[PDB]
Amino acid sequence: MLKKVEDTLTMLVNATSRQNAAIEALENRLSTLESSLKPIQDMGKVISSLNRSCAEMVAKYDLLEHH
Amino acid sequence: LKKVEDTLTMLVNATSRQNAAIEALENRLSTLESSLKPIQDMGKVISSLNRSCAEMVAKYDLLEHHH
Amino acid sequence: LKKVEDTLTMLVNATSRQNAAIEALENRLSTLESSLKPIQDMGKVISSLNRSCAEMVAKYDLLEHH
Amino acid sequence: LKKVEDTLTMLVNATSRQNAAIEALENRLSTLESSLKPIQDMGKVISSLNRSCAEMVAKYDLLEHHHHHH
């Protein structure tokens, strides 16, 4: 009787452990997304500085203009 | 009854390891959400950049030849 | 004996909880993946924004020495 | 003797469902991964824009004092 059960239990332990692994494997896949982002984040900071640098030039012109 | 209880414990230690790997995986995800916020928010900055940079040319293209 | 049934039950509920936990996560992901179109769409705005600047540099370079 | 097999059969089904939950999460990731490639490529375009724009204002500011003074 017990044989099939000792066996079915050793199935699950192995399978669960397979999944544990699948999941650890999935986290690295994530950390690596998070860190490929950085270059993106950077470029955003560049667009922002660039918006400011323009807008500042308009302001500088609006005053120059009236002459 | 030994093997069942032995393996049934192998398994409980395996199932609670998974709880831990799942939690660990959310936190990477959660952290990944954060790190996109800057980027989603980006669409809006680009548009402002376009507007400002448009505006900056206007004020110069006209105002240039004018003086 | 009984400790074996009760320990199996405990397990089964704990795993269903993890299925839920995981399915949950996929939903969360898809939510993000949908967030990106709006940005990806801008890369075409950045491109005609570049072209337009480059052409101005071009114009002003020619016109400079003039 | 029974209840044990019954519940075992439940726990086999539930763990099998997870192989499938996990596989099904791998796919939504592999697709998130894909849709960023487009955005990393915007980065290339942004630096050249940052070049290109910065040069405009180089050719503004030089020609400003140079065709307004002369």
Side-chain angles (χ1 to χ4, degrees), chain A residues 6 9-10 12-13 16 19-20 23 26-27 30-31 34 37 40-41 44 47 50-51 54 58 61 65 67, chain B residues 3-4 7 10-11 14 17-18 21 24-25 28-29 31-32 35 39 42 45 48-49 52 56 60 63 67:
Chain A
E6 295 171 12
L9 277 173
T10 35
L12 293 171
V13 171
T16 306
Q19 290 162 43
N20 282 325
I23 283 167
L26 258 182
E27 161 175 41
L30 269 176
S31 298
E34 183 169 307
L37 286 177
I40 299 174
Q41 294 192 46
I47 288 166
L50 216 60
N51 186 16
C54 281
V58 163
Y61 286 126
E65 184 190 11
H67 169 75
Chain B
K3 178 152 180 212
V4 176
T7 311
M10 286 243 317
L11 186 56
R17 238 171 273 128
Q18 239 210 111
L25 176 64
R28 276 303 171 289
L29 175 40
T31 316
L32 174 75
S35 280
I39 300 165
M42 200 158 88
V45 186
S48 303
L49 177 47
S52 335
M56 175 184 64
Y60 202 66
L63 176 83
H67 292 288

mmCIF file of all heavy atoms in Angstrom, chain A residues 6 9-10 12-13 16 19-20 23 26-27 30-31 34 37 40-41 44 47 50-51 54 58 61 65 67, chain B residues 3-4 7 10-11 14 17-18 21 24-25 28-29 31-32 35 39 42 45 48-49 52 56 60 63 67:
data_model
loop_
_atom_site.group_PDB
_atom_site.id
_atom_site.type_symbol
_atom_site.label_atom_id
_atom_site.label_comp_id
_atom_site.label_asym_id
_atom_site.label_seq_id
_atom_site.Cartn_x
_atom_site.Cartn_y
_atom_site.Cartn_z
ATOM 1 N N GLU A 6 5.079 6.494 -0.563
ATOM 2 C CA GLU A 6 6.463 6.868 -0.348
ATOM 3 C C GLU A 6 7.043 7.408 -1.647
ATOM 4 O O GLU A 6 7.863 8.338 -1.652
ATOM 5 C CB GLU A 6 7.236 5.624 0.044
ATOM 6 C CG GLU A 6 6.811 5.011 1.373
ATOM 7 C CD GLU A 6 7.443 3.650 1.623
ATOM 8 O OE1 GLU A 6 8.379 3.267 0.879
ATOM 9 O OE2 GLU A 6 6.992 2.966 2.566
ATOM 10 N N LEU A 9 5.235 10.757 -2.777
ATOM 11 C CA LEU A 9 5.817 11.835 -1.972
ATOM 12 C C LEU A 9 7.166 12.306 -2.489
ATOM 13 O O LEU A 9 7.429 13.502 -2.513
ATOM 14 C CB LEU A 9 5.987 11.357 -0.546
ATOM 15 C CG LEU A 9 4.762 11.453 0.337
ATOM 16 C CD1 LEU A 9 5.053 10.792 1.663
ATOM 17 C CD2 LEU A 9 4.476 12.910 0.535
ATOM 18 N N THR A 10 8.017 11.349 -2.886
ATOM 19 C CA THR A 10 9.352 11.611 -3.423
ATOM 20 C C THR A 10 9.222 12.173 -4.812
ATOM 21 O O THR A 10 10.150 12.781 -5.349
ATOM 22 C CB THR A 10 10.158 10.343 -3.458
ATOM 23 O OG1 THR A 10 9.262 9.277 -3.754
ATOM 24 C CG2 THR A 10 10.733 10.039 -2.118
ATOM 25 N N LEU A 12 6.772 14.558 -5.544
ATOM 26 C CA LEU A 12 6.464 15.935 -5.211
ATOM 27 C C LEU A 12 7.638 16.741 -4.657
ATOM 28 O O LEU A 12 7.852 17.899 -5.019
ATOM 29 C CB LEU A 12 5.394 15.894 -4.150
ATOM 30 C CG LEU A 12 4.072 15.356 -4.632
ATOM 31 C CD1 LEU A 12 3.161 15.151 -3.480
ATOM 32 C CD2 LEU A 12 3.515 16.387 -5.549
ATOM 33 N N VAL A 13 8.394 16.144 -3.748
ATOM 34 C CA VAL A 13 9.537 16.832 -3.169
ATOM 35 C C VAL A 13 10.491 17.259 -4.268
ATOM 36 O O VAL A 13 11.005 18.382 -4.242
ATOM 37 C CB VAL A 13 10.240 15.933 -2.190
ATOM 38 C CG1 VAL A 13 11.526 16.520 -1.753
ATOM 39 C CG2 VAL A 13 9.382 15.764 -1.019
ATOM 40 N N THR A 16 8.814 19.912 -6.410
ATOM 41 C CA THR A 16 8.607 21.206 -5.792
ATOM 42 C C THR A 16 9.932 21.881 -5.890
ATOM 43 O O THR A 16 10.014 23.072 -6.253
ATOM 44 C CB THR A 16 8.193 21.177 -4.347
ATOM 45 O OG1 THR A 16 7.043 20.358 -4.192
ATOM 46 C CG2 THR A 16 7.842 22.594 -3.902
ATOM 47 N N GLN A 19 10.599 23.566 -8.870
ATOM 48 C CA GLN A 19 9.907 24.813 -9.061
ATOM 49 C C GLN A 19 10.613 25.932 -8.336
ATOM 50 O O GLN A 19 10.767 27.041 -8.872
ATOM 51 C CB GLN A 19 8.515 24.673 -8.545
ATOM 52 C CG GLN A 19 7.690 23.781 -9.388
ATOM 53 C CD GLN A 19 6.475 23.315 -8.656
ATOM 54 O OE1 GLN A 19 5.804 24.091 -7.962
ATOM 55 N NE2 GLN A 19 6.188 22.027 -8.772
ATOM 56 N N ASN A 20 11.031 25.618 -7.105
ATOM 57 C CA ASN A 20 11.838 26.513 -6.272
ATOM 58 C C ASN A 20 12.885 27.116 -7.159
ATOM 59 O O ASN A 20 13.089 28.333 -7.200
ATOM 60 C CB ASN A 20 12.549 25.740 -5.149
ATOM 61 C CG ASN A 20 11.623 25.389 -3.941
ATOM 62 O OD1 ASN A 20 10.746 26.148 -3.591
ATOM 63 N ND2 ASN A 20 11.899 24.263 -3.263
ATOM 64 N N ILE A 23 11.862 29.352 -9.914
ATOM 65 C CA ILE A 23 11.455 30.644 -9.413
ATOM 66 C C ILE A 23 12.667 31.495 -9.111
ATOM 67 O O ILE A 23 12.643 32.700 -9.331
ATOM 68 C CB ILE A 23 10.641 30.482 -8.161
ATOM 69 C CG1 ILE A 23 9.246 30.033 -8.529
ATOM 70 C CG2 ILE A 23 10.585 31.792 -7.350
ATOM 71 C CD1 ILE A 23 8.481 29.558 -7.342
ATOM 72 N N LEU A 26 13.735 32.767 -12.074
ATOM 73 C CA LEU A 26 12.892 33.868 -12.557
ATOM 74 C C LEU A 26 13.218 35.216 -11.929
ATOM 75 O O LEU A 26 12.936 36.278 -12.494
ATOM 76 C CB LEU A 26 11.426 33.584 -12.279
ATOM 77 C CG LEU A 26 10.578 33.108 -13.449
ATOM 78 C CD1 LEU A 26 9.164 32.943 -12.965
ATOM 79 C CD2 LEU A 26 10.575 34.051 -14.617
ATOM 80 N N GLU A 27 13.789 35.173 -10.742
ATOM 81 C CA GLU A 27 14.137 36.379 -10.068
ATOM 82 C C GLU A 27 15.361 37.008 -10.742
ATOM 83 O O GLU A 27 15.396 38.214 -10.988
ATOM 84 C CB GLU A 27 14.392 36.042 -8.630
ATOM 85 C CG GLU A 27 15.170 37.051 -7.937
ATOM 86 C CD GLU A 27 15.293 36.717 -6.507
ATOM 87 O OE1 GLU A 27 15.494 35.504 -6.216
ATOM 88 O OE2 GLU A 27 15.178 37.674 -5.696
ATOM 89 N N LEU A 30 14.659 38.828 -13.530
ATOM 90 C CA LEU A 30 14.011 40.107 -13.209
ATOM 91 C C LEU A 30 15.035 41.164 -12.833
ATOM 92 O O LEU A 30 15.052 42.231 -13.452
ATOM 93 C CB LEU A 30 12.982 39.987 -12.078
ATOM 94 C CG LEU A 30 11.512 39.692 -12.403
ATOM 95 C CD1 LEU A 30 10.782 39.544 -11.152
ATOM 96 C CD2 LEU A 30 10.834 40.772 -13.204
ATOM 97 N N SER A 31 15.859 40.882 -11.816
ATOM 98 C CA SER A 31 16.974 41.742 -11.443
ATOM 99 C C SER A 31 17.684 42.305 -12.656
ATOM 100 O O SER A 31 18.040 43.486 -12.730
ATOM 101 C CB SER A 31 17.950 40.924 -10.679
ATOM 102 O OG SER A 31 17.373 40.429 -9.490
ATOM 103 N N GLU A 34 15.695 44.873 -14.218
ATOM 104 C CA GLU A 34 15.677 46.099 -13.483
ATOM 105 C C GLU A 34 16.907 46.889 -13.835
ATOM 106 O O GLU A 34 16.837 48.107 -14.011
ATOM 107 C CB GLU A 34 15.583 45.904 -11.987
ATOM 108 C CG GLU A 34 15.494 47.261 -11.302
ATOM 109 C CD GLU A 34 15.137 47.168 -9.855
ATOM 110 O OE1 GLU A 34 14.118 46.510 -9.559
ATOM 111 O OE2 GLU A 34 15.878 47.754 -9.026
ATOM 112 N N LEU A 37 17.648 48.905 -17.120
ATOM 113 C CA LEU A 37 16.733 50.022 -17.233
ATOM 114 C C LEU A 37 17.530 51.218 -17.128
ATOM 115 O O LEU A 37 17.234 52.205 -17.754
ATOM 116 C CB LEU A 37 15.758 50.091 -16.095
ATOM 117 C CG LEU A 37 14.694 49.031 -16.192
ATOM 118 C CD1 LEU A 37 13.841 49.149 -14.973
ATOM 119 C CD2 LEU A 37 13.858 49.222 -17.476
ATOM 120 N N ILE A 40 18.007 53.638 -19.579
ATOM 121 C CA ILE A 40 16.761 54.327 -19.879
ATOM 122 C C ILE A 40 16.583 55.458 -18.900
ATOM 123 O O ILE A 40 16.501 56.590 -19.327
ATOM 124 C CB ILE A 40 15.565 53.411 -19.845
ATOM 125 C CG1 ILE A 40 15.760 52.327 -20.887
ATOM 126 C CG2 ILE A 40 14.317 54.185 -20.160
ATOM 127 C CD1 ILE A 40 14.709 51.233 -20.888
ATOM 128 N N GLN A 41 16.586 55.160 -17.601
ATOM 129 C CA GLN A 41 16.465 56.198 -16.600
ATOM 130 C C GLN A 41 17.366 57.380 -16.913
ATOM 131 O O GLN A 41 16.917 58.541 -16.828
ATOM 132 C CB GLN A 41 16.810 55.682 -15.228
ATOM 133 C CG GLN A 41 15.861 54.673 -14.756
ATOM 134 C CD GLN A 41 16.035 54.371 -13.309
ATOM 135 O OE1 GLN A 41 16.161 55.290 -12.495
ATOM 136 N NE2 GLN A 41 16.055 53.080 -12.962
ATOM 137 N N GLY A 44 16.184 59.641 -19.641
ATOM 138 C CA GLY A 44 15.110 60.485 -19.160
ATOM 139 C C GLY A 44 15.648 61.734 -18.498
ATOM 140 O O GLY A 44 15.177 62.851 -18.703
ATOM 141 N N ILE A 47 16.517 64.124 -21.285
ATOM 142 C CA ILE A 47 15.377 64.781 -21.876
ATOM 143 C C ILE A 47 14.918 65.911 -20.974
ATOM 144 O O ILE A 47 14.614 66.990 -21.449
ATOM 145 C CB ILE A 47 14.293 63.776 -22.065
ATOM 146 C CG1 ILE A 47 14.702 62.870 -23.177
ATOM 147 C CG2 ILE A 47 13.047 64.415 -22.481
ATOM 148 C CD1 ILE A 47 13.914 61.688 -23.232
ATOM 149 N N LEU A 50 17.025 68.778 -20.995
ATOM 150 C CA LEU A 50 17.029 69.340 -22.334
ATOM 151 C C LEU A 50 15.825 70.192 -22.492
ATOM 152 O O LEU A 50 15.886 71.206 -23.174
ATOM 153 C CB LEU A 50 16.984 68.240 -23.372
ATOM 154 C CG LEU A 50 17.779 68.531 -24.620
ATOM 155 C CD1 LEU A 50 19.292 68.753 -24.386
ATOM 156 C CD2 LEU A 50 17.537 67.375 -25.496
ATOM 157 N N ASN A 51 14.733 69.767 -21.855
ATOM 158 C CA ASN A 51 13.553 70.571 -21.776
ATOM 159 C C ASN A 51 13.937 71.845 -21.058
ATOM 160 O O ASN A 51 13.838 72.919 -21.653
ATOM 161 C CB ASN A 51 12.458 69.832 -21.054
ATOM 162 C CG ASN A 51 11.143 70.574 -21.077
ATOM 163 O OD1 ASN A 51 10.959 71.486 -21.852
ATOM 164 N ND2 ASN A 51 10.234 70.201 -20.206
ATOM 165 N N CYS A 54 15.953 74.345 -23.003
ATOM 166 C CA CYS A 54 15.279 75.017 -24.116
ATOM 167 C C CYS A 54 14.477 76.146 -23.591
ATOM 168 O O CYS A 54 14.761 77.303 -23.880
ATOM 169 C CB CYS A 54 14.336 74.086 -24.837
ATOM 170 S SG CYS A 54 15.333 73.091 -25.879
ATOM 171 N N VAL A 58 14.081 80.204 -24.454
ATOM 172 C CA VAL A 58 12.874 80.920 -24.822
ATOM 173 C C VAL A 58 12.788 82.124 -23.908
ATOM 174 O O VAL A 58 12.839 83.269 -24.368
ATOM 175 C CB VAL A 58 11.639 80.020 -24.600
ATOM 176 C CG1 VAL A 58 10.364 80.831 -24.570
ATOM 177 C CG2 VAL A 58 11.575 78.944 -25.665
ATOM 178 N N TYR A 61 15.056 84.569 -24.809
ATOM 179 C CA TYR A 61 14.704 85.262 -26.051
ATOM 180 C C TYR A 61 13.549 86.250 -25.866
ATOM 181 O O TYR A 61 13.708 87.420 -26.208
ATOM 182 C CB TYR A 61 14.446 84.274 -27.201
ATOM 183 C CG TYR A 61 15.732 83.662 -27.741
ATOM 184 C CD1 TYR A 61 15.912 82.283 -27.838
ATOM 185 C CD2 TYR A 61 16.779 84.477 -28.155
ATOM 186 C CE1 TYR A 61 17.110 81.744 -28.333
ATOM 187 C CE2 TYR A 61 17.969 83.947 -28.645
ATOM 188 C CZ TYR A 61 18.128 82.597 -28.730
ATOM 189 O OH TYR A 61 19.325 82.153 -29.216
ATOM 190 N N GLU A 65 13.846 89.696 -27.401
ATOM 191 C CA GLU A 65 12.935 89.999 -28.490
ATOM 192 C C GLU A 65 12.633 91.491 -28.557
ATOM 193 O O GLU A 65 13.076 92.174 -29.488
ATOM 194 C CB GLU A 65 11.636 89.188 -28.311
ATOM 195 C CG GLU A 65 10.593 89.318 -29.432
ATOM 196 C CD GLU A 65 9.221 88.694 -29.081
ATOM 197 O OE1 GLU A 65 8.974 88.334 -27.898
ATOM 198 O OE2 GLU A 65 8.382 88.572 -30.005
ATOM 199 N N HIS A 67 13.495 94.248 -28.031
ATOM 200 C CA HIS A 67 14.416 95.140 -28.729
ATOM 201 C C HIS A 67 14.306 94.986 -30.273
ATOM 202 O O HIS A 67 14.021 95.951 -31.018
ATOM 203 C CB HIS A 67 15.853 94.875 -28.269
ATOM 204 C CG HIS A 67 16.873 95.567 -29.111
ATOM 205 N ND1 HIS A 67 17.114 96.921 -29.023
ATOM 206 C CD2 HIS A 67 17.666 95.106 -30.104
ATOM 207 C CE1 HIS A 67 18.032 97.259 -29.910
ATOM 208 N NE2 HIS A 67 18.386 96.178 -30.577
ATOM 209 N N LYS B 3 9.432 6.286 6.282
ATOM 210 C CA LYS B 3 9.783 6.925 4.999
ATOM 211 C C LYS B 3 8.846 8.066 4.605
ATOM 212 O O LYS B 3 9.216 9.053 3.957
ATOM 213 C CB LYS B 3 9.768 5.882 3.871
ATOM 214 C CG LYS B 3 10.074 6.500 2.486
ATOM 215 C CD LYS B 3 10.721 5.507 1.491
ATOM 216 C CE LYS B 3 11.029 6.120 0.079
ATOM 217 N NZ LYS B 3 10.871 5.020 -0.992
ATOM 218 N N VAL B 4 7.601 7.875 4.983
ATOM 219 C CA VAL B 4 6.543 8.787 4.649
ATOM 220 C C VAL B 4 6.693 10.087 5.354
ATOM 221 O O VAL B 4 6.590 11.124 4.738
ATOM 222 C CB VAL B 4 5.274 8.218 5.153
ATOM 223 C CG1 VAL B 4 4.153 9.179 4.906
ATOM 224 C CG2 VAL B 4 5.024 6.906 4.478
ATOM 225 N N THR B 7 9.968 11.712 4.213
ATOM 226 C CA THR B 7 9.829 12.417 2.957
ATOM 227 C C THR B 7 8.790 13.540 3.063
ATOM 228 O O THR B 7 8.900 14.562 2.394
ATOM 229 C CB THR B 7 9.478 11.455 1.851
ATOM 230 O OG1 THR B 7 10.378 10.348 1.901
ATOM 231 C CG2 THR B 7 9.653 12.123 0.561
ATOM 232 N N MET B 10 10.576 16.371 4.060
ATOM 233 C CA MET B 10 11.476 16.846 3.026
ATOM 234 C C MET B 10 10.640 17.826 2.288
ATOM 235 O O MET B 10 11.089 18.875 1.832
ATOM 236 C CB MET B 10 11.874 15.735 2.049
ATOM 237 C CG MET B 10 12.873 14.692 2.558
ATOM 238 S SD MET B 10 14.493 14.543 1.733
ATOM 239 C CE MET B 10 14.054 14.646 -0.007
ATOM 240 N N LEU B 11 9.383 17.453 2.176
ATOM 241 C CA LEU B 11 8.463 18.200 1.363
ATOM 242 C C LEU B 11 7.984 19.479 2.029
ATOM 243 O O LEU B 11 7.759 20.461 1.351
ATOM 244 C CB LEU B 11 7.253 17.340 1.041
ATOM 245 C CG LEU B 11 6.248 17.925 0.062
ATOM 246 C CD1 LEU B 11 6.889 18.283 -1.225
ATOM 247 C CD2 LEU B 11 5.184 16.893 -0.143
ATOM 248 N N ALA B 14 10.365 21.819 1.627
ATOM 249 C CA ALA B 14 10.477 22.264 0.238
ATOM 250 C C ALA B 14 9.397 23.299 -0.105
ATOM 251 O O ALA B 14 9.649 24.269 -0.823
ATOM 252 C CB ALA B 14 10.442 21.079 -0.709
ATOM 253 N N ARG B 17 10.218 26.667 1.362
ATOM 254 C CA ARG B 17 11.327 27.316 0.690
ATOM 255 C C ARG B 17 10.702 28.064 -0.420
ATOM 256 O O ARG B 17 11.221 29.061 -0.846
ATOM 257 C CB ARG B 17 12.310 26.321 0.095
ATOM 258 C CG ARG B 17 13.779 26.410 0.576
ATOM 259 C CD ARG B 17 14.739 25.233 0.120
ATOM 260 N NE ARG B 17 14.750 24.044 1.010
ATOM 261 C CZ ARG B 17 14.561 22.756 0.626
ATOM 262 N NH1 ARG B 17 14.320 22.400 -0.664
ATOM 263 N NH2 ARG B 17 14.597 21.786 1.545
ATOM 264 N N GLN B 18 9.578 27.580 -0.914
ATOM 265 C CA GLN B 18 9.035 28.179 -2.109
ATOM 266 C C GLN B 18 8.342 29.447 -1.749
ATOM 267 O O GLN B 18 8.447 30.434 -2.455
ATOM 268 C CB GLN B 18 8.028 27.296 -2.776
ATOM 269 C CG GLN B 18 8.363 26.907 -4.214
ATOM 270 C CD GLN B 18 7.125 26.678 -5.031
ATOM 271 O OE1 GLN B 18 6.791 27.439 -5.939
ATOM 272 N NE2 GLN B 18 6.384 25.644 -4.652
ATOM 273 N N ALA B 21 10.765 31.878 -1.952
ATOM 274 C CA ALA B 21 11.296 32.244 -3.264
ATOM 275 C C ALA B 21 10.257 33.075 -3.997
ATOM 276 O O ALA B 21 10.576 33.892 -4.868
ATOM 277 C CB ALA B 21 11.622 31.009 -4.067
ATOM 278 N N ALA B 24 10.386 36.516 -2.575
ATOM 279 C CA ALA B 24 11.607 37.112 -2.986
ATOM 280 C C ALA B 24 11.475 37.634 -4.387
ATOM 281 O O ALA B 24 12.205 38.538 -4.817
ATOM 282 C CB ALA B 24 12.609 36.104 -2.943
ATOM 283 N N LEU B 25 10.544 37.032 -5.107
ATOM 284 C CA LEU B 25 10.319 37.341 -6.514
ATOM 285 C C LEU B 25 9.387 38.518 -6.699
ATOM 286 O O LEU B 25 9.594 39.297 -7.592
ATOM 287 C CB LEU B 25 9.730 36.126 -7.192
ATOM 288 C CG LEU B 25 9.336 36.303 -8.641
ATOM 289 C CD1 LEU B 25 10.520 36.583 -9.467
ATOM 290 C CD2 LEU B 25 8.785 35.050 -9.138
ATOM 291 N N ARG B 28 11.332 41.625 -6.152
ATOM 292 C CA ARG B 28 12.128 42.122 -7.241
ATOM 293 C C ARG B 28 11.191 42.877 -8.126
ATOM 294 O O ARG B 28 11.526 43.975 -8.568
ATOM 295 C CB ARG B 28 12.900 41.057 -7.989
ATOM 296 C CG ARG B 28 14.186 40.740 -7.299
ATOM 297 C CD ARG B 28 15.083 41.959 -7.096
ATOM 298 N NE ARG B 28 16.189 41.580 -6.227
ATOM 299 C CZ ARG B 28 16.063 41.330 -4.919
ATOM 300 N NH1 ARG B 28 14.870 41.419 -4.322
ATOM 301 N NH2 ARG B 28 17.140 41.000 -4.191
ATOM 302 N N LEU B 29 9.998 42.309 -8.326
ATOM 303 C CA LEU B 29 8.999 42.878 -9.236
ATOM 304 C C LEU B 29 8.597 44.240 -8.749
ATOM 305 O O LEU B 29 8.700 45.223 -9.474
ATOM 306 C CB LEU B 29 7.735 42.012 -9.316
ATOM 307 C CG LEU B 29 6.562 42.574 -10.161
ATOM 308 C CD1 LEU B 29 6.980 43.238 -11.413
ATOM 309 C CD2 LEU B 29 5.641 41.495 -10.621
ATOM 310 N N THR B 31 10.146 46.195 -6.831
ATOM 311 C CA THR B 31 11.244 47.093 -7.165
ATOM 312 C C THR B 31 11.329 47.475 -8.643
ATOM 313 O O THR B 31 11.811 48.543 -8.960
ATOM 314 C CB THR B 31 12.559 46.476 -6.791
ATOM 315 O OG1 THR B 31 12.435 45.889 -5.496
ATOM 316 C CG2 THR B 31 13.642 47.537 -6.745
ATOM 317 N N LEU B 32 10.884 46.595 -9.540
ATOM 318 C CA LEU B 32 10.940 46.833 -10.983
ATOM 319 C C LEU B 32 9.853 47.828 -11.367
ATOM 320 O O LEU B 32 10.012 48.639 -12.268
ATOM 321 C CB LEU B 32 10.726 45.525 -11.753
ATOM 322 C CG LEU B 32 10.629 45.659 -13.279
ATOM 323 C CD1 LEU B 32 11.949 45.893 -13.793
ATOM 324 C CD2 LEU B 32 10.092 44.433 -13.939
ATOM 325 N N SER B 35 11.102 51.277 -10.728
ATOM 326 C CA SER B 35 12.173 51.713 -11.569
ATOM 327 C C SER B 35 11.664 52.052 -12.934
ATOM 328 O O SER B 35 12.390 52.618 -13.734
ATOM 329 C CB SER B 35 13.290 50.669 -11.596
ATOM 330 O OG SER B 35 14.124 50.750 -10.426
ATOM 331 N N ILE B 39 10.047 56.169 -16.093
ATOM 332 C CA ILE B 39 10.087 55.985 -17.520
ATOM 333 C C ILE B 39 8.712 56.178 -18.072
ATOM 334 O O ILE B 39 8.562 56.738 -19.134
ATOM 335 C CB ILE B 39 10.588 54.588 -17.860
ATOM 336 C CG1 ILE B 39 12.003 54.413 -17.274
ATOM 337 C CG2 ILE B 39 10.551 54.380 -19.350
ATOM 338 C CD1 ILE B 39 12.479 53.024 -17.206
ATOM 339 N N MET B 42 7.803 59.420 -18.430
ATOM 340 C CA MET B 42 8.673 60.039 -19.409
ATOM 341 C C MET B 42 7.933 60.557 -20.607
ATOM 342 O O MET B 42 8.276 61.595 -21.149
ATOM 343 C CB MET B 42 9.668 59.039 -19.904
ATOM 344 C CG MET B 42 10.839 59.623 -20.526
ATOM 345 S SD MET B 42 12.124 58.357 -20.447
ATOM 346 C CE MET B 42 11.764 57.497 -21.956
ATOM 347 N N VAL B 45 7.352 64.153 -20.470
ATOM 348 C CA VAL B 45 8.493 65.051 -20.510
ATOM 349 C C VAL B 45 8.946 65.351 -21.938
ATOM 350 O O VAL B 45 9.314 66.467 -22.281
ATOM 351 C CB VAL B 45 9.672 64.404 -19.812
ATOM 352 C CG1 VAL B 45 10.827 65.392 -19.719
ATOM 353 C CG2 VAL B 45 9.269 63.896 -18.427
ATOM 354 N N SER B 48 6.891 67.711 -23.523
ATOM 355 C CA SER B 48 7.129 69.071 -23.131
ATOM 356 C C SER B 48 8.334 69.473 -23.906
ATOM 357 O O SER B 48 8.363 70.574 -24.427
ATOM 358 C CB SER B 48 7.356 69.257 -21.631
ATOM 359 O OG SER B 48 6.258 68.761 -20.869
ATOM 360 N N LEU B 49 9.302 68.560 -24.048
ATOM 361 C CA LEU B 49 10.534 68.863 -24.785
ATOM 362 C C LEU B 49 10.255 69.298 -26.231
ATOM 363 O O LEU B 49 10.752 70.316 -26.745
ATOM 364 C CB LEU B 49 11.445 67.670 -24.799
ATOM 365 C CG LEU B 49 12.704 67.915 -25.628
ATOM 366 C CD1 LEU B 49 13.394 69.274 -25.324
ATOM 367 C CD2 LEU B 49 13.665 66.763 -25.422
ATOM 368 N N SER B 52 8.748 72.931 -26.157
ATOM 369 C CA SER B 52 9.768 73.896 -25.812
ATOM 370 C C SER B 52 10.759 74.101 -26.926
ATOM 371 O O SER B 52 11.179 75.202 -27.179
ATOM 372 C CB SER B 52 10.459 73.343 -24.605
ATOM 373 O OG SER B 52 9.523 72.495 -23.976
ATOM 374 N N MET B 56 11.428 77.292 -29.136
ATOM 375 C CA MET B 56 12.749 77.887 -29.157
ATOM 376 C C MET B 56 13.208 78.240 -30.566
ATOM 377 O O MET B 56 13.952 79.201 -30.760
ATOM 378 C CB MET B 56 13.751 76.942 -28.546
ATOM 379 C CG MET B 56 15.134 77.485 -28.659
ATOM 380 S SD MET B 56 16.368 76.364 -28.053
ATOM 381 C CE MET B 56 16.218 74.993 -29.191
ATOM 382 N N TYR B 60 13.554 82.185 -32.565
ATOM 383 C CA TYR B 60 14.805 82.527 -33.177
ATOM 384 C C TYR B 60 14.707 82.686 -34.680
ATOM 385 O O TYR B 60 15.249 83.629 -35.236
ATOM 386 C CB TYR B 60 15.811 81.469 -32.875
ATOM 387 C CG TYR B 60 17.195 81.973 -33.007
ATOM 388 C CD1 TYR B 60 17.684 82.942 -32.164
ATOM 389 C CD2 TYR B 60 18.034 81.473 -33.975
ATOM 390 C CE1 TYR B 60 18.984 83.393 -32.280
ATOM 391 C CE2 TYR B 60 19.335 81.910 -34.094
ATOM 392 C CZ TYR B 60 19.807 82.865 -33.250
ATOM 393 O OH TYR B 60 21.104 83.291 -33.388
ATOM 394 N N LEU B 63 12.668 86.052 -35.079
ATOM 395 C CA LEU B 63 13.529 87.085 -34.494
ATOM 396 C C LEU B 63 14.920 87.196 -35.115
ATOM 397 O O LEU B 63 15.538 88.238 -35.009
ATOM 398 C CB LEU B 63 13.678 86.873 -32.984
ATOM 399 C CG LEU B 63 14.587 87.719 -32.087
ATOM 400 C CD1 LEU B 63 13.959 89.005 -31.644
ATOM 401 C CD2 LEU B 63 14.972 86.917 -30.881
ATOM 402 N N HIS B 67 16.353 91.048 -37.188
ATOM 403 C CA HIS B 67 17.407 91.922 -36.655
ATOM 404 C C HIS B 67 18.781 91.531 -37.211
ATOM 405 O O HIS B 67 18.939 91.290 -38.409
ATOM 406 C CB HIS B 67 17.435 91.861 -35.107
ATOM 407 C CG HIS B 67 16.233 92.467 -34.439
ATOM 408 N ND1 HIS B 67 15.980 93.830 -34.371
ATOM 409 C CD2 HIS B 67 15.185 91.879 -33.784
ATOM 410 C CE1 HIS B 67 14.864 94.048 -33.733
ATOM 411 N NE2 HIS B 67 14.352 92.883 -33.355
#
